[PDB]
Amino acid sequence: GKGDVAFITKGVFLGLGISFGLFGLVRLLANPETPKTMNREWQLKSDEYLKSKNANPWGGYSQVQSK
Amino acid sequence: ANKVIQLQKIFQSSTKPLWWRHPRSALYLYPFYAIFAVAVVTPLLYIPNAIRGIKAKKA
Amino acid sequence: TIAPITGTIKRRVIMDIVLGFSLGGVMASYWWWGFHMDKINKREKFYAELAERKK
Amino acid sequence: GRIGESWVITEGRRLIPEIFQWSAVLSVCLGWPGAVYFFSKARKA
Amino acid sequence: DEETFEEFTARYEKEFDEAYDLFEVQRVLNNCFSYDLVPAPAVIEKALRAARRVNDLPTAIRVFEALKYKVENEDQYKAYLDELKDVRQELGVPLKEELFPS
Amino acid sequence: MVQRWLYSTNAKDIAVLYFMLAIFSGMAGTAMSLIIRLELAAPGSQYLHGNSQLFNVLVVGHAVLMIFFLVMPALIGGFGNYLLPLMIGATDTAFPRINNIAFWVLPMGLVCLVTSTLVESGAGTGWTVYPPLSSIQAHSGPSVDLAIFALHLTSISSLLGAINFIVTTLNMRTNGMTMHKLPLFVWSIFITAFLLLLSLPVLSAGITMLLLDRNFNTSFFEVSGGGDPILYEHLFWFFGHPEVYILIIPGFGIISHVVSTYSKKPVFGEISMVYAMASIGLLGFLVWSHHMYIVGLDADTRAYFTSATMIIAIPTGIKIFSWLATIHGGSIRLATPMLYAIAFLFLFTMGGLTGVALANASLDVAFHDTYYVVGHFHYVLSMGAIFSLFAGYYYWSPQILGLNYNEKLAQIQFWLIFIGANVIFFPMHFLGINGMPRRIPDYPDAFAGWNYVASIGSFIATLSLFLFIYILYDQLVNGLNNKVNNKSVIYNKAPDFVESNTIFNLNTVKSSSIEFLLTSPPAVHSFNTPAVQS
Amino acid sequence: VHFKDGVYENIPFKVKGRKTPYALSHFGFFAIGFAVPFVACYVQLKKSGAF
Amino acid sequence: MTHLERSRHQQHPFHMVMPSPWPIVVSFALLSLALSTALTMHGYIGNMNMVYLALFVLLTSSILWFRDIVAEATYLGDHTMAVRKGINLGFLMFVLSEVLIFAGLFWAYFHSAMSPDVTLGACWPPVGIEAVQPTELPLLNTIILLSSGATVTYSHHALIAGNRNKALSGLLITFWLIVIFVTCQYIEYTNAAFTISDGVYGSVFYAGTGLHFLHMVMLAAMLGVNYWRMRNYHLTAGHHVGYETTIIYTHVLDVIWLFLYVVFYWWGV
Amino acid sequence: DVPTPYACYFQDSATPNQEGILELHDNIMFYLLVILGLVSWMLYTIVMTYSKNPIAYKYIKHGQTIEVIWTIFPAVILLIIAFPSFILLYLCDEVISPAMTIKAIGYQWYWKYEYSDFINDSGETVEFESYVIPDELLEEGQLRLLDTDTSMVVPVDTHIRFVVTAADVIHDFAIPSLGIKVDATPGRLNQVSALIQREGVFYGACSELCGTGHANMPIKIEAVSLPKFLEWLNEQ
Ligand code: HEA
Ligand code: HEA
Ligand code: CUA
Ligand SMILES: [Ca+2]
Ligand SMILES: [Cu+2]
Ligand SMILES: [Mg+2]
């Protein structure tokens, strides 16, 4: 009644934002060093190998997902 | 020796709890609480050595 | 007169069930003939070009 | 008798917008990972 | 129920005639509009006279609100309003749209 | 104060002790799942410094706590012991000291499970504690013994409560209530108690066999000695599929109550719902080897088991079509139990359709021990049984507590858990169909993309759990004021369209069960004279 | 035994008339439950030399 | 009777049990038993005194619970007809649960025997294992069980028929025959070639018949308490339900011993 | 052949078993999407046209002429999805005239492969253990938690029979793009077949909880042509 749909829309978006922010703040407490394979150069050098071995022909083989 | 009416007249006309209403209940109930009180807390004393990893002396 | 107006939930559930089967049918037919029969064709043109790369 | 507007008109003008609303709600309820993949770096954009 | 429409009207005419207070006329009106048919004009007329006997005016307005919600068109509603007009003006009940105009 | 709660003998007190333990252990299992899902967020060691044994121990604790210490003592232990005597008109359960020991053996299972975690390394074996990993060669120490004793004490509780339930609804029904005129929740607890009584023996036999194998040098599942671990798989899963139908059948009863009272029309074909529940319970004993499709059975074995696993889609389909038919043509009052029931009716069917994908042993070679299976069962568990559990709480809490909850906060909590659970468990099908295996603390780097979004959704789910904790606090403190102001729904049924606001006031509650006619918080002696029914 | 009826007498814990705030008991009941796996994690990481 | 005096009773036939400490006492005894055996199995406790104390506390707490049940049924008159029907139904569900435990054990035997391993030699009973022959002592053990049922049947029907000496003597004969069976099983277990560690054969054999042995020693205990309560006039001619449960228990232990006999001693040799 | 980031479908098939598994999965998913569209459309339209309905049709309880229909119609759709499933089930079990056997024994956190046919000029059985390359010794470009130090090499267009067992606990020899999943239990020997249709390299992993090294236990299969297989086998 009279603007409680708006309240339980704002509360849902606020809960999503608080969850994203606290997820970020406890991702800041993880291991400081990601594995060596999670950069762009390693993944291009793995797609090198996969192209040489004809991997995943009709789908895709490319492994690059990081920067 | 057919004491059942005489015991009905005690168990129904009583104020005490049901496990206390017999005359011989102080002979069962007072040792049992001591035996129970050591039986439930002595493994709880060995819980920290089991966490630390200290085995008992056997040799 | 006013002729009897009866049975609107009958024809309503009949059109609702028919519409539900038709919407599920167009979703599933898109699934098959647009995703599955693209994956199949990308697979089989690879196998048919392999069977000529082997002469 | 069949007084009034036809039932195909009466229920088409009710069922037509709810088809589109169902399509929108179903595609946001199922295709929400497409919105993450579109902004992920694996798309190379 | 394997009921025909005519058995429905003859059941609910004599069901409205035997209601004796406001609980009963509202109850009978509820469980006659809770079917998959708009009631015939005769049983709506019997419902109006029954709400007259119990002397409650908003139930005789809610009758017309209920059949507005119950018919398929607005021309079926206007057909009810045509030949239910005489009993409505005789009892003197207003329709809700002309009572609370938006 | 010690005689009402320690020496307890009324079912309505043992039910709230069950509920307190259930929500405590659910906080424990949700914390364990948060640690699991936080470690799984990215490749490499993140929070547990390597140490995959600790990951496996946490997975064991998460599964055992959430199944045997949240869903069973919540649904069966709380709701059955509270509501089945009140809905059959019984003054109490038959055998009430049994009903008290069936609660008080659960904190003891909890403390032995927690010290199973604290001794040498914990039992990291899965919740299906398979030998030879669960043996004495691969798991040295008292960890697995204490986990087996936790399962023993929980099986003692759920067997004694099952005997209690069967006898108290075959014997203590009030004086108009034939078996055909039972509520659907009573039929749920009834059929669940038979499944418990028929299935918990074989589990107790199998894990006592395992315990004797570990400690008494006997060889039931030791290969160098004549054993076979496939015998453990058979003896476990003959309990294990009846266990998961035990988890869901009271959920079916709760949903059939909620959907009917918020559609304001009765359930479409009630006796066919009873027949469907009984058929699910009967057929659940014939399907146990669909968890054993890979172990090396024959082809005709697997053909029968696909057939029998497939033909349980018929009574569940009858139930779900009946739920859609009993909301069709209704007057839906969108309250929080109704929101949870509609979310059940969608997400449970999605989990069941992935279940019939898994039912084909031809296809289950592509999906066994993958995260696809994890997606199926976490759908039908944390969106079937947890959603029906939340529906039962929001449906019965103000009646049986006397205190209303904040309605807007409840709907915020619902939408947050409905978003968050979807975000956890929907990408698991993508991971499982691409080949990601189960029970791994670390994965290849190609699985990072959906694992990250799943652990983002994990925080939404636990945020809604924290909101639920605050909803409990606001209900316990301000629950008498929520009736006065407009922060809560006081009547779960509105007046009918021609029912006056004053004619509604003499008949405020219109229910088909006794639970909503009682005094709020119900009396210590409900039914002094027996209730009567035509 | 005849027990008390009413609104707050069905729960084993005290809510209204307390010398301490109720939120203490309420949130410390659940923070212990949320904190059992962290005690588990701490002792099984101190046993494995990671701390 | 008048309304004023009918209002001083219960209006419904069901036992509203008084609050009792033995549920939480037996629960803590099961805790102490679990925590004691899981630490003496792995050497964190020196001797078996903790396990002995825990089993003793468990047994005495169960005895005090049964004493209170006897007190309610005899000295307070709380067991009406509906309560009797409920107790009989609960005991029937209990014996169905135990028959299902034995069905799991028979499944274990059959899964080891229907097609055995290669490490025993595609053989049943395995090579080197000297199996117990079904003719000597287990035949006497079937005879003294089929006869124990025949004794307890006339003891029951003479309890109904008004006889006192013909029921007490039949109960005494039943109890002594049960302890004859238990001592004969002890003699077989001592003079058996294989042990419980001698492979899967000794495992399944001693599991099945040792669970039956434990059920028979509890059967001897409840036959003894039925003799005590019949001599001390607790049991009556129309209201003897613990006796009836013991009769049901004898007649299901008889048929599961027969299944153990024909499976473990005839088909499996 | 290898998982890709953000993927949502199967890996690309390499055997007829996996390419049949994909078709059966899509055929099941067809009717599954029909049923999902039906129940989601009903669940949408009911709560969007009866949430604003003030009169509930409270006398609809039986529906006899349509309860039989929604009992019968799930059964015939079960029959339709069960017709190809039985054909695939009874096609994938026959291991008829294979040209190669390979044993795969799962130890705790390595696999041990054993070509046992003595088609060599050496005439002796070929075995080797394949361990995961640890993360600190990965040379650059290698796939983490997938690459091994030694490999299992198999010729193409050859019926191969994998005989799978274990040594201490239960493992699982699983390669998804080949579509083989087979439990290695320490008592028995299972078998699967494959026919590799294209050369390449296909990865898999232990899909059964082995313990604390369960994630560190991969499978790597190089399928080559038969000359290159022979020249590989001539060494090891
Ligand atoms: C009861 C069933 C149940 C529930 C609810 C959950 C809930 C969750 N589970 Fe899990 N899970 C299992 C049963 C369950 N799980 C089982 C059986 C396994 C197998 C273990 C094995 O492989 O051996 C498993 C394993 C498992 C895996 C696979 C990991 C692996 O294979 O090793 C993952 C993946 O991240 C996971 C995560 C989660 C997450 C993030 C939640 C989140 O959904 C948590 C969010 C849920 C809530 C917030 C619920 C509300 C909380 C309450 C306390 C309800 C209170 C309400 C009242 C009391 C009225 N759990
Ligand atoms: C809440 C408990 C629960 C419920 C209700 C179910 C329901 C079902 N489950 Fe599930 N399952 C689990 C809990 C549950 N499951 C757990 C815990 C595991 C993993 C254990 C472990 O490994 O640790 C598991 C894993 C599991 C496996 C093992 C796979 C593997 O481990 O490799 C299989 C195999 O067949 C299976 C199938 C099914 C089927 C066919 C149903 C059916 O009952 C579903 C029926 C419902 C529907 C079918 C949808 C509604 C119907 C219609 C809309 C009608 C029209 C539809 C059709 C005609 C198809 N599930
Ligand atoms: Cu080998 Cu897991
Ligand atoms: Ca990780
Ligand atoms: Cu199952
Ligand atoms: Mg497996």
Domain ranges of chain H: 1-78, 79-269
Q: Which residue of G has its CA nearest to F26?
A: G33
Q: Which residues pair with I192 in a beta bridge?
A: I162
User: How far is Cα H129 from Cα H134, in angstroms, rounded to an integer?
Assistant: 15
H79-269 CATH = 1.20.120.80
Query: Which residues on adjacent β-strands are paired with residue I126?
Result: I115
* Angstroms from C10 CA to nearest CA on chain E: 8
Closest CA to I142 of D43, A60, A36, A61: A36
Q: Which helix (H) or strand (E) holds A54?
A: none
Long-range contacts of B47-54 (CB under 8 A, 24+ apart): B47/F115, B47/H35, B49/H44, B50/F115, B50/F119, B50/F142, B50/H39, B50/H44, B51/F115, B51/F118, B51/F119, B51/G43, B53/F120, B54/H44
For residues E28 and E15, the answer to whether their CB atoms sit within 8 Å is yes
- Please name the residue that has the structure tokens 């057939």: F307
Which stretch of DSSP H or E encloses residue I218? strand I218-224
- Which of H150, H142, H159, H179 lies closest to H226, judged by CA? H159
I159 a known binding residue?
no
Confirm if A60 and I4 have CB atoms less than 8 A apart: yes
Q: DSSP code of C6?
A: B
Select from F44, F459, F486 the Cβ nearest to the Cβ of A34: F44
CA end-to-end span of chain D: 64
- Asked if the C-beta of F218 comes within 8 angstroms of chain H's C-beta atoms, the answer is yes
How many Å apart are CA D37 and CA I5, to the nearest integer? 10
Q: In angstroms, rounded to a whole number, what is the distance separating the alpha carbons of residues F514 and F85?
A: 10
CA F56 to ligand 5 centroid distance, Å: 22
Token pair 């035990």: residue? F246
By residue range, what is the domain housing residue D24? 1-45
Domain with E82, as residue range(s), is 1-102
F519: DSSP letter: P
Compute CA distances H58 → B43, D7, F291, whole Å: 15, 76, 38
User: Kind and range of the H or E element at E45?
Assistant: helix E41-54
The token duo for I160 is 């191969």
Do residues F270 and F179 make contact, with C-beta atoms less than 8 angstroms apart?
no
Angle, helices I16-49/F313-327, rounded to nearest 10 degrees: 20
- Residue B45, C-beta contacts closer than 8 angstroms, at least 6 positions apart: none
Query: By alpha-carbon position, which residue is closest to atom 1 of ligand 3?
Result: I171
- Parse chain B into domains and list their residue ranges: 1-59
Asked if residues I222 and I154 have their Cβ atoms less than 8 Å apart, the reply is yes
- Who's near F320: CB < 8 A, 6+ residues apart? F345, F348, F349, I39
F4 is catalytic: no
* Annotated resolution, angstroms: 2.8
Cα separation, F190 vs F171, in Å, equals 12
Residue D44 Ramachandran class (φ > 0 left, ψ -120 to 50 alpha, else beta): left
- Tell me the CATH architecture of domain H1-78: Orthogonal Bundle (1.10)
**Cα–Cα–Cα angle for H250, H256, H259, rounded to 5 degrees:** 145
What are chain I's domains? 16-92 (1.10.287.90), 100-235 (2.60.40.420)
Q: Helices H, strands E: what count in chain I?
A: 4, 10
Q: Which atom of ligand 3 is nearest to the CA of I210?
A: 2
Would you call H27 helix, strand, or coil by DSSP? Answer: helix
Known catalytic residue at F243: yes
8 Å CB contact between F193 and F204: no
Q: How far apart are CA F248 and CA F253, in angstroms?
A: 9
DSSP F179: G
Cβ within 8 Å of residue D4, ≥6 positions away = D10, E72, E73, E74, E75, E76, E79
Q: What are chain F's domains?
A: 1-484 (1.20.210.10)
Could you say which DSSP state residue H132 is in?
A: P
**CB interface of D with A, residues 26-45, below 8 Å:** 40-42, 44
How many CB contacts within 8 angstroms connect chain B with chain H?
91
Q: In Å, how far is I133's CA from the nearest CA of chain F?
A: 13
Chains touching I (3+ CB pairs < 8 Å) = A, C, D, E, F
| Other beta carbons within 10 Å of H266 | 11
> Using CB atoms, which chains have 3+ pairs under 8 A with A?
C, D, F, I
F368 carries a ligand binding annotation: yes
Q: Is residue I210 part of an annotated ligand binding site?
A: yes
Nearest CA in chain F to C9: F329
| Torsion, CA F513, CA F517, CA F519, CA F524, rounded to 10 | -30
I5 preceded by a cis bond (ω within 30 of 0): no
Q: Which residues contact F462 (CB under 8 A, 6 or more apart)?
A: F30, F34, F420
**Could you count the other beta carbons within 10 Å of the beta carbon of residue I194?**
26
DSSP I50-110: STT--S--TT----HHHHTHHHHHHHHHHHHHHHHHHHHHTTSS---S-SEEEEEEEETTE
Q: How far separated are the first and last CA of chain H, in Å rounded?
A: 69
Query: Using the beta-carbon criterion (under 8 Å), do A7 and F408 form an inter-chain contact?
Result: yes
Please state, in angstroms and rounded to a whole number, the distance separating the CA atoms of residues C19 and C30: 16
CB-CB contact of H151 with H235 (8 Å) = no
Active-site choice (F290, F396, F407, F429) = F290
Structural domain count of chain E: 1
SS3 content of chain B, % helix, strand, coil (to 5): 65, 0, 35
Experimental technique behind these coordinates: cryo-EM
Nearest-angstrom CA–CA distance, F123 and F145: 9
Size of interface F-H (CB pairs under 8 A): 182
Look at chain D and report how many structural domains it folds into: 1
Is F256 marked active-site?
A: yes
Q: How far apart are CA F393 and CA F20, in angstroms?
A: 13
Domains of chain G: 1-51 (4.10.49.10)
CB F284 within 8 A of CB F241: yes
Kindly state the tokens that stand for I58: 């409270």
CA H93 – CA H96 distance, rounded (Å): 5
CB contact at 8 A, I55 and E66: yes
Nearest Cα to H58, choosing from B39, B26, F147?
B39
Whether the upstream peptide bond of residue H125 has omega within 30° of 0, thus cis, is: yes
